[PDB]
């Protein structure tokens, strides 16, 4: 597992910093530690695993949304996420039509403006796709009655 390796190596780095901690006054060591911490935190925030996301109460929309956020915030090395997305969309074909509008009225609904991209590259079957063509797809129903029956409140 990559997570225990990350934990042990960052613990080693923390021990190293503790060895270098006492002389915090110096500006040279100040900027050295500053840059070190910047790099390590920027790397750690991105290298997050995906194990903690899956829950038994998670629905199809919740799972696709979790892996969508994973794609839009973490794509450096985790390249199999798109393959899993393509595999999963074929599973939830019947469930994907439950939480959508008609064509003509969905676009005018509030909040579809910001979620048009996530919806488009949900429907297309490839998270790498770009909505440059300005196409209109089945807009997601954002109503609370639909959301509660098709989502989970914790992963909003």
């Amino acid at each position: 597992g990559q997570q225990p390796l990350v934990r042990r190596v960052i613990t080693q780095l923390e021990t190293a910093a503790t060895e270098a901690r006492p002389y915090v006054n110096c500006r040279a060591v100040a900027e050295l530690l500053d840059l070190t911490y910047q790099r390590l935190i920027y790397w750690a925030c991105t290298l997050m695993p995906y194990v903690l996301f899956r829950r038994d109460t998670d629905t199809e929309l919740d799972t696709v949304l979790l892996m969508h956020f994973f794609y839009t915030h973490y794509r450096s090395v985790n390249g199999d996420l798109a393959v899993e997305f393509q595999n999963y969309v074929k599973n939830s074909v019947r469930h994907m039509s439950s939480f959508v509008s008609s064509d003509i009225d969905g676009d005018q609904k509030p909040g579809a403006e910001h979620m048009r991209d996530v919806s488009y590259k949900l429907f297309v079957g490839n998270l790498q796709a770009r909505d440059a063509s300005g196409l209109m797809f089945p807009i997601i129903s954002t109503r609370i009655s639909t959301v509660n029956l098709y989502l989970s409140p914790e992963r909003m």
């Binding site: 008609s102 064509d103 003509i104 063509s133 300005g134 196409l135 209109m136 797809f137 089945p138």
Partner: protein
């Protein structure tokens, strides 16, 4: 001949009815142009 009336003239019920028409979700996704369009029967060259 019925062909002359059918070609040089159209049924008044098409004129009376609504002109614009909507479209469905099922093709490879539509754009704005396809979203609301004139009905093919009402449209004339």
């Amino acid at each position: 001949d019925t062909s002359r009336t059918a070609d040089s003239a159209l049924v008044s019920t098409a004129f009376g009815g609504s002109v614009f028409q909507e479209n469905r979700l099922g093709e490879t996704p539509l754009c704005r142009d396809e979203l609301v369009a004139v009905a093919p029967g009402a449209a004339s060259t």
